[PDB]
Amino acid sequence: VNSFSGYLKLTDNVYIKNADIVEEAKKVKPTVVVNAANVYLKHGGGVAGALNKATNNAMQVESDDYIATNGPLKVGGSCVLSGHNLAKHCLHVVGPNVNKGEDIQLLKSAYENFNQHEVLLAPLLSAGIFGADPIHSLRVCVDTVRTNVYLAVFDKNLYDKLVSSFL
Numbered sequence: 001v002n003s004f005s006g007y008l009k010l011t012d013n014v015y016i017k018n019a020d021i022v023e024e025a026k027k028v029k030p031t032v033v034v035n036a037a038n039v040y041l042k043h044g045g046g047v048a049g050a051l052n053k054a055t056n057n058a059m060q061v062e063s064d065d066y067i068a069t070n071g072p073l074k075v076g077g078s079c080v081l082s083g084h085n086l087a088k089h090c091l092h093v094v095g096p097n098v099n100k101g102e103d104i105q106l107l108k109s110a111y112e113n114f115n116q117h118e119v120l121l122a123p124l125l126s127a128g129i130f131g132a133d134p135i136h137s138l139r140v141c142v143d144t145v146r147t148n149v150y151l152a153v154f155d156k157n158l159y160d161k162l163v164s165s166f167l
């Protein structure tokens with residue numbers, strides 16, 4: 001048994017809810033929250049800016065030190081950093097950004113990072129301002145992630161479309 005509440009069960013291991021991932025993280029304090037990161041860990045907007053804003057910019061300060069030491073992530077790659085006030089850990093995962101011309105086939109590689117963690121709170125990768133089709137992102141998630149994933153979908157309209165179209 002875990003602390004996640006009000007999720008619809010899609011498969012053996014994938015759950016979904018219409019929720020603000022920031023508000024969900026603050027309530028649950030999960031072991032792992034996933035950030036929709038870019039390779040520079042520049043948390044300007046979307047899930048990254050909202051998560052970063054909720055940490056009072058401490059996520060961005062930690063991230064800048066990580067990049068100064070290690071250099072940029074790979075598209076499809078990840079790193080584990082602090083979860084600050086939101087979670088034990090933040091798994092920063094880089095899905096391909098369609099609005100920058102990145103290979104959508106890298107979305108499966110991105111979701112494979114989640115299999116290194118038994119339970120995660122996550123957004124859909126490559127959707128929203130990343131320019132991928134969220135229906136596609138949910139299908140890749142279900143067909144790739146084998147660990148227990150709790151998906152938070154911000155847009156109520158999109159949530160309802162994802163549920164009603166799910167195969």
Ligand SMILES: COc1ccc2[nH]cc(CC(=O)O)c2c1
Pocket residue numbers: 036045046047123124125126127128129130134152153154155158
């Ligand atoms: C605006 O920044 C982002 C970044 C990644 C995202 N993944 C999915 C969504 C849409 C949603 O949850 O409604 C989204 C939005």
